[PDB]
Design an enzyme around this catalytic site. Structure first.
Site, mmCIF file in Angstrom:
data_model
loop_
_atom_site.group_PDB
_atom_site.id
_atom_site.type_symbol
_atom_site.label_atom_id
_atom_site.label_comp_id
_atom_site.label_asym_id
_atom_site.label_seq_id
_atom_site.Cartn_x
_atom_site.Cartn_y
_atom_site.Cartn_z
ATOM 1 N N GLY A 29 0.784 -1.219 0.000
ATOM 2 C CA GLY A 29 0.000 0.000 0.000
ATOM 3 C C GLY A 29 0.817 1.270 0.000
ATOM 4 O O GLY A 29 2.029 1.255 0.196
ATOM 5 N N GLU A 30 0.126 2.370 -0.232
ATOM 6 C CA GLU A 30 0.740 3.663 -0.399
ATOM 7 C C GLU A 30 -0.141 4.649 0.340
ATOM 8 O O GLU A 30 -1.357 4.514 0.342
ATOM 9 C CB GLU A 30 0.816 4.021 -1.886
ATOM 10 C CG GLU A 30 1.724 5.210 -2.185
ATOM 11 C CD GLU A 30 1.692 5.682 -3.628
ATOM 12 O OE1 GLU A 30 1.725 4.824 -4.544
ATOM 13 O OE2 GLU A 30 1.674 6.919 -3.831
ATOM 14 N N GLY A 31 0.476 5.607 1.006
ATOM 15 C CA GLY A 31 -0.251 6.648 1.662
ATOM 16 C C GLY A 31 0.424 7.943 1.350
ATOM 17 O O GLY A 31 1.491 7.986 0.735
ATOM 18 N N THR A 32 -0.225 9.006 1.763
ATOM 19 C CA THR A 32 0.377 10.310 1.851
ATOM 20 C C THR A 32 1.772 10.290 2.567
ATOM 21 O O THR A 32 2.699 11.015 2.182
ATOM 22 C CB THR A 32 -0.605 11.268 2.553
ATOM 23 O OG1 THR A 32 -0.033 12.559 2.608
ATOM 24 C CG2 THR A 32 -0.929 10.810 4.011
ATOM 25 N N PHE A 33 1.909 9.445 3.588
ATOM 26 C CA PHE A 33 3.167 9.315 4.355
ATOM 27 C C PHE A 33 4.335 8.728 3.580
ATOM 28 O O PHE A 33 5.486 9.011 3.881
ATOM 29 C CB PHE A 33 2.940 8.454 5.612
ATOM 30 C CG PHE A 33 2.377 7.084 5.318
ATOM 31 C CD1 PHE A 33 3.194 6.054 4.835
ATOM 32 C CD2 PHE A 33 1.033 6.821 5.532
ATOM 33 C CE1 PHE A 33 2.679 4.796 4.564
ATOM 34 C CE2 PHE A 33 0.507 5.562 5.264
ATOM 35 C CZ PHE A 33 1.340 4.546 4.777
ATOM 36 N N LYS A 35 5.016 4.625 1.975
ATOM 37 C CA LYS A 35 4.881 3.326 1.318
ATOM 38 C C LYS A 35 4.769 2.252 2.386
ATOM 39 O O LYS A 35 5.405 2.377 3.428
ATOM 40 C CB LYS A 35 6.158 3.091 0.499
ATOM 41 C CG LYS A 35 5.999 2.535 -0.877
ATOM 42 C CD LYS A 35 7.337 2.590 -1.610
ATOM 43 C CE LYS A 35 7.244 1.911 -2.981
ATOM 44 N NZ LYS A 35 8.581 1.567 -3.569
ATOM 45 N N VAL A 36 4.005 1.190 2.132
ATOM 46 C CA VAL A 36 4.060 0.005 2.997
ATOM 47 C C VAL A 36 4.356 -1.214 2.166
ATOM 48 O O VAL A 36 3.720 -1.411 1.148
ATOM 49 C CB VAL A 36 2.756 -0.217 3.791
ATOM 50 C CG1 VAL A 36 2.921 -1.354 4.802
ATOM 51 C CG2 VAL A 36 2.385 1.047 4.536
ATOM 52 N N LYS A 52 6.648 -0.051 6.985
ATOM 53 C CA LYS A 52 6.167 1.238 6.596
ATOM 54 C C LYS A 52 7.400 2.063 6.323
ATOM 55 O O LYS A 52 8.257 2.210 7.187
ATOM 56 C CB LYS A 52 5.326 1.839 7.722
ATOM 57 C CG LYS A 52 4.742 3.211 7.435
ATOM 58 C CD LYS A 52 3.855 3.667 8.570
ATOM 59 C CE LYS A 52 3.039 4.867 8.153
ATOM 60 N NZ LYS A 52 2.125 5.314 9.233
ATOM 61 N N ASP A 149 -7.149 10.544 13.382
ATOM 62 C CA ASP A 149 -7.224 10.152 11.953
ATOM 63 C C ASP A 149 -7.865 8.760 11.775
ATOM 64 O O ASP A 149 -7.382 7.920 11.029
ATOM 65 C CB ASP A 149 -5.820 10.184 11.354
ATOM 66 C CG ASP A 149 -5.806 10.012 9.848
ATOM 67 O OD1 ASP A 149 -6.741 10.487 9.173
ATOM 68 O OD2 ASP A 149 -4.872 9.358 9.348
HETATM 69 C C1 LIG Z 1 -0.661 -6.767 -2.352
HETATM 70 N N1 LIG Z 1 -1.131 -8.145 -2.150
HETATM 71 C C2 LIG Z 1 -2.586 -8.217 -2.270
HETATM 72 C C3 LIG Z 1 -3.069 -9.637 -2.096
HETATM 73 N N2 LIG Z 1 -2.670 -10.143 -0.775
HETATM 74 C C4 LIG Z 1 -3.657 -10.581 0.049
HETATM 75 O O1 LIG Z 1 -4.830 -10.572 -0.282
HETATM 76 C C5 LIG Z 1 -3.358 -11.025 1.497
HETATM 77 C C6 LIG Z 1 -4.639 -11.587 2.141
HETATM 78 C C7 LIG Z 1 -2.303 -12.149 1.497
HETATM 79 C C8 LIG Z 1 -2.939 -9.733 2.233
HETATM 80 C C9 LIG Z 1 -3.579 -8.523 1.965
HETATM 81 C C10 LIG Z 1 -3.191 -7.351 2.591
HETATM 82 C C11 LIG Z 1 -2.141 -7.349 3.500
HETATM 83 C C12 LIG Z 1 -1.700 -6.059 4.121
HETATM 84 O O2 LIG Z 1 -1.726 -5.016 3.484
HETATM 85 N N3 LIG Z 1 -1.267 -6.116 5.426
HETATM 86 C C13 LIG Z 1 -0.847 -5.057 6.233
HETATM 87 C C14 LIG Z 1 -0.764 -3.737 5.906
HETATM 88 N N4 LIG Z 1 -0.364 -3.115 7.062
HETATM 89 C C15 LIG Z 1 -0.168 -1.778 7.323
HETATM 90 C C16 LIG Z 1 0.167 -1.356 8.572
HETATM 91 C C17 LIG Z 1 0.292 0.096 8.915
HETATM 92 C C18 LIG Z 1 -0.194 1.083 8.057
HETATM 93 C C19 LIG Z 1 -0.004 2.413 8.391
HETATM 94 N N5 LIG Z 1 0.612 2.820 9.506
HETATM 95 C C20 LIG Z 1 1.065 1.866 10.325
HETATM 96 C C21 LIG Z 1 0.931 0.509 10.081
HETATM 97 C C22 LIG Z 1 0.356 -2.382 9.584
HETATM 98 C C23 LIG Z 1 0.172 -3.701 9.328
HETATM 99 C C24 LIG Z 1 -0.212 -4.100 8.029
HETATM 100 N N6 LIG Z 1 -0.505 -5.301 7.527
HETATM 101 C C25 LIG Z 1 -1.502 -8.557 3.779
HETATM 102 C C26 LIG Z 1 -1.909 -9.730 3.170
HETATM 103 C C27 LIG Z 1 -1.206 -10.072 -0.622
HETATM 104 C C28 LIG Z 1 -0.725 -8.644 -0.836
#
Ligand SMILES: CN1CCN(C(=O)C(C)(C)c2ccc(C(=O)Nc3cn4cc(-c5ccncc5)ccc4n3)cc2)CC1
EC number: 2.7.12.1
Length: 350
Positions: A29-33, A35-36, A52, A149
């Site tokens: 994922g991507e945010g204003t902040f 990248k994750v 992050k 937020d």
């Molecule tokens: C791109 N693909 C999409 C397809 N996939 C999937 O359907 C699975 C189920 C394997 C999956 C989906 C999403 C995550 C995830 O996005 N998980 C996460 C973000 N995330 C973001 C902070 C966070 C944020 C912002 N500030 C602080 C923390 C913390 C924990 C955290 N776990 C994982 C598995 C695989 C990935």
């Protein structure tokens, strides 16, 4: 051998390493902040980590330092990790990019909704999710902290695996998440009682009237956000689909009734009023949009049954204009709506 975007972002691809430790294996994922990214932690046995990666820009680095600080504080006061905040495992500076490593969780509740064609979560899921939100945020609230937020993107399922059902009424498929356990994420805006409070906080759709009217804010801000979120979980669309203050205030009145007159006397934002009434152009685009699309809160109930009436009473109480009269999370947790929780949901044992 390290390079940046024109804006802050770190350029990196699958396979790249960081701190001789974290191997990137996916983009999350991507945010204003920034990248994750998904990473494997080659110190704790290839364990999965959400990493992050913050932009190499002052504003954002500052916010991330503040986030690390808050997560540090939460971890001190919740060693048992009972209060459902996303677990920070490590942090570091990598060439001016603050990086924070978290437990890997599933999709956030916005993305789940989106991948489900914005078809809402069913009421039992709304209830369990609301309970956990109330529980998690009461804890931060009793520790002199305001998230500010809160929004669906910042609430994450622990595991977002689903089962696919067929809705008879609607003639289509529906994804229904198997486990509704969630965590609260992103503390880059979270503010202690004793810190400076900026005039304007929250992203617009989840922003309370005391903020718009510049009356000051504190923990009640989160409660309003939560009410918008609950609504959004239950209907699948955003309660205040807005982009400017006047429109937003009009929508609050169309949906919730008149802004209490004591808040109108107090605000320095008198351009929004005339003889104690909101002023607005009904013939503009925003005007016509609001008139066509915003109706009173109760008219959005999908069923007549008790549990639904209770949801709407709780929401109504979370969306009280006056932050002094708004329901607190401690009180919210005692609302009769949470009677319908399973014992397992009430005790946090999934
Ligand atoms: C791109 N693909 C999409 C397809 N996939 C999937 O359907 C699975 C189920 C394997 C999956 C989906 C999403 C995550 C995830 O996005 N998980 C996460 C973000 N995330 C973001 C902070 C966070 C944020 C912002 N500030 C602080 C923390 C913390 C924990 C955290 N776990 C994982 C598995 C695989 C990935």
């Amino acid at each position: 051998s390290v390079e940046d975007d024109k804006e802050g972002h770190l350029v990196c691809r699958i396979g790249d390493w960081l701190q001789e430790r974290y191997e990137i294996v996916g983009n999350l994922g991507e945010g204003t902040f920034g990248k994750v990214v998904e990473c494997l932690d080659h110190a704790r046995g290839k364990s999965q980590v959400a990493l992050k990666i913050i932009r190499n820009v002052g504003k954002y680095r500052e916010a991330a330092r503040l986030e690390i600080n808050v997560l540090k504080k939460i971890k001190e006061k919740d060693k048992e990790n009972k209060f459902l905040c996303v677990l920070m495992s490590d942090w570091f500076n990598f060439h001016g990019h603050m990086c924070i490593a978290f437990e890997l969780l599933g999709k956030n509740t916005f993305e789940f909704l989106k991948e489900n064609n914005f078809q809402p979560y069913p009421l039992p899921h709304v209830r369990h999710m609301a309970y956990q939100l109330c529980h998690a945020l009461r804890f931060l609230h009793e520790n002199q902290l305001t998230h500010t937020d809160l929004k669906p993107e910042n609430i994450l399922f622990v595991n977002s695996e689903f089962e696919t059902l067929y809705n008879e009424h609607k003639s289509c498929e529906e994804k229904s998440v198997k486990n509704t356990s969630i965590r609260v994420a992103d503390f880059g805006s979270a503010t202690f009682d004793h810190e400076h409070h900026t005039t304007i906080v929250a992203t617009r759709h989840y922003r309370p009237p005391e903020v718009i009217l510049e009356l000051g804010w504190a923990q009640p801000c989160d409660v309003w956000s939560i009410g918008c979120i609950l609504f959004e979980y239950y209907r699948g669309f955003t309660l205040f689909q807005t982009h400017e203050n006047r429109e937003h205030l009009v929508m609050m009145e169309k949906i919730l009734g008149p802004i209490p007159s004591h808040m109108i006397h107090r605000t320095r934002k008198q351009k929004y009023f005339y003889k104690g009434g909101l002023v607005w152009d009904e013939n503009s685009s925003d005007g016509r949009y609001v008139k066509e699309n915003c109706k009173p809160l109760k008219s959005y109930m999908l069923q007549d049954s008790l549990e639904h009436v209770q949801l709407f009473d709780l929401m109504r109480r979370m969306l009280e204009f006056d932050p002094a009269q708004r329901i607190t999370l401690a009180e919210a947790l005692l609302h009769p709506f949470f009677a319908g929780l399973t014992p397992e949901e009430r005790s946090f044992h999934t």
